[PDB]
Amino acid sequence: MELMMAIGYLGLALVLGSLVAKIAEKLKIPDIPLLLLLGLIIGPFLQIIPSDSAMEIFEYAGPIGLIFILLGGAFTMRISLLKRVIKTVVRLDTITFLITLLISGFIFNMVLNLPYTSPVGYLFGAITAATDPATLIPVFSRVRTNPEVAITLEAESIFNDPLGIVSTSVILGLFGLFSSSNPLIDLITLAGGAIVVGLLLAKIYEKIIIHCDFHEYVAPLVLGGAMLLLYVGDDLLPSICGYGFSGYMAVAIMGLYLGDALFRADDIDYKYIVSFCDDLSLLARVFIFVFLGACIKLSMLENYFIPGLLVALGSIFLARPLGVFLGLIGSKHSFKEKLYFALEGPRGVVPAALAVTVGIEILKNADKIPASITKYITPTDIAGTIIIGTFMTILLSVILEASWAGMLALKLLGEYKPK
Amino acid sequence: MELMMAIGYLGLALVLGSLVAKIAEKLKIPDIPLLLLLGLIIGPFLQIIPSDSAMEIFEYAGPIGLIFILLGGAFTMRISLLKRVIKTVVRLDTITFLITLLISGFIFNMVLNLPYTSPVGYLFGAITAATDPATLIPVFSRVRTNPEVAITLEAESIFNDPLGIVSTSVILGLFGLFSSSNPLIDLITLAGGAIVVGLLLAKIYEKIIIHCDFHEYVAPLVLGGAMLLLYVGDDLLPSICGYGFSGYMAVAIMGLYLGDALFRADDIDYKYIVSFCDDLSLLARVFIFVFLGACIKLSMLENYFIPGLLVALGSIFLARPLGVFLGLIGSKHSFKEKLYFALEGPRGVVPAALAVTVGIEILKNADKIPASITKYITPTDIAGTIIIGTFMTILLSVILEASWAGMLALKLLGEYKPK
């Protein structure tokens, strides 16, 4: 665990990563594939980090990294704003999200030939359903859409954030359950709890900021404040109850409300935040993608390469696209938004940790207690697949979206000519 | 080691600390005493953290924290610039520094009544001699001196940085030695090595930055690059040789050269760096002072309260002031610079870690192997004292300097009337 090694490797990551990111900025190309390639080079190719070690580092670093990008993603944008294309945004985001997860459960189960009740398939499907913004919707969205869509993508992103947790709970229930007591209270408690206290601080922050003085001192407040939300949510309240409120959704809600409350007010106290959050959110994303890669255990992969690839294509081309086409149908229009609903595959911040976290949770405790469910299916490959599918999942979703985003941003000027 | 607790406590530190720092900015008062008071409140008073735990966290966090403030301190200023009052600055900084350490060795030994050859006293004296800038010379120096003195204070700060390490080596030699092989190569190897590679990157950085493109991407480069310097210096090269170059002096030299090389060139690529480094350097200093406090083991303190207090007064009033008065004597002038040489007691970033690091190193390995030197003196109190003396040391040096800095900045306009 030698510290000097940790700061050394972290140093190499910052030095090489900053340079590569800058080259990308002067190259137009989007970060993510370059981040993954770097992850391979310092990963399998040069053998600079193994699986066990990568996962061990990630157990500590990941929550810190995740708090960074969630905070960075929130501040790089706003709210109020969101309420005009919003009917489509909420119906499509919520209803199409649940349907996509359902689609994910079924194909993943069938391709393996494993039983439908079996939970591994439904987990894989659950991972596909989750979106993640923060790595790519905010990074391309620095520059305009300018219509509806940027706000929605943010909303979709965050909207899931209340969804990804719900999906994780569902996956926990059916793949066997550590606790069978609630299939419903946990949904309430996490979302509702995160909403209440998040609004509590956003309101508190709203008043305290407007009355005075920090300005500048507002940054430690949320960064420590967000930190407390995790401690209260996933450690303190489960300890004192088994009753927790999560934390992640709670900080998401706080950022969502607070950004709007700040922006809504106007005045001198807004410029600076966009640049600061963009710079901050960059280091974490570079580090997270590579560290997300290194967290996975070393040797994944040979057996489940083909299925995960096949599962991925179903999510990108069938589940995603059917979702948008069957979730927007009442639109105008068109041929620009419904297609956007399709192609999904942006999330990768949530499900990633959850994929790996579930992987260690079931695989390690397997010998000690694997709820005796889906053992002979056999899971060994469930844990293995999820990670590649998400990898593959990021790469192809990220690569394709990055390649056609400009074409789908301007090329689709809606051809609306009113005179 | 539960992560959620770590990010939770860290979160509380950021939230409360940012607010307190902002209040201070709107209050004029200087951070440091407030940081120490907070450290007490979450320390002994409320029992939020113990010694063992605080030191355990500090072993990991401290090198990360130390890299932050060293980098922040460098960028908040420049170089080239330093070369006009510089004769006084180098003679006073170097020659008065060694003399101060010598003074520290003697009084500390005598007050205990322990033997002069005995190394514990010379360690205590060594700790007094070390200065540390970064926490208070840069923080007050955001606003002008405007003469000579700000540049010197920076130089004194950094100049020691090559000195604090030398002092630590000297302390290691005489308080018993793990290795008796070199009392001279280590001085060369650390300083010389840090100089060479530091200049290597500063030159490399100088060319690569001027030719292109990062701008913004220069921040990861040094932050990872600085990280590698620690790994190469205090882990890799000692492992592959027993031959190390430190790292800290090396990153200090790199920052010193690079800041000047960047500033010397001029052009659009300088604004932004001052604000960025100031903001970055703040979080670390708040966290470092409180975390420096929490690193020390719980129960220090009752036996050696009085001596450390007495040792402190000798350093502040006798060793410091004799040093400046006997180190400047050839000045003009006057009654404004010689007095500044006196009052010392600003350092607290280096000796702190070194104080605690030596404390664990000798106290823990004592039963296993305490080089059998100064055991019956007895050390138990050496380790205990150093920490309080440095605490006391920061508080009184920081409090007094902060109180009279304005008076000594303008009140001493040199009364120079040339016509």
Curated annotation (Swiss-Prot), chains A, B:
Changing R320H: Almost no change in activity. One of its GO terms (biological process) is intracellular potassium ion homeostasis. Pfam families: Na_H_Exchanger. GO terms for cellular component: plasma membrane. Changing D93A: Strong decrease in activity. The chain crosses the membrane at residues 1-21, 29-49, 57-77, 95-115, 120-140, 158-178, 184-204, 208-228, 236-256, 286-306, 309-329, 382-402. It is found in: Cell membrane. Changing R347A: Strong decrease in activity. Changing D161A: Loss of activity. One of its GO terms (molecular function) is identical protein binding. Keywords: Antiport, Cell membrane, Ion transport, Membrane, Sodium, Sodium transport, Transmembrane, Transmembrane helix, Transport. Active at pH 7.0 and below. It is a multi-pass membrane protein. This is a Na(+)/H(+) antiporter. Can also transport lithium. Belongs to the monovalent cation:proton antiporter 1 (CPA1) transporter (TC 2.A.36) family. This is Na(+)/H(+) antiporter 1. It comes from Methanocaldococcus jannaschii (strain ATCC 43067 / DSM 2661 / JAL-1 / JCM 10045 / NBRC 100440). The lineage of its organism: Archaea, Methanobacteriati, Methanobacteriota, Methanomada group, Methanococci.
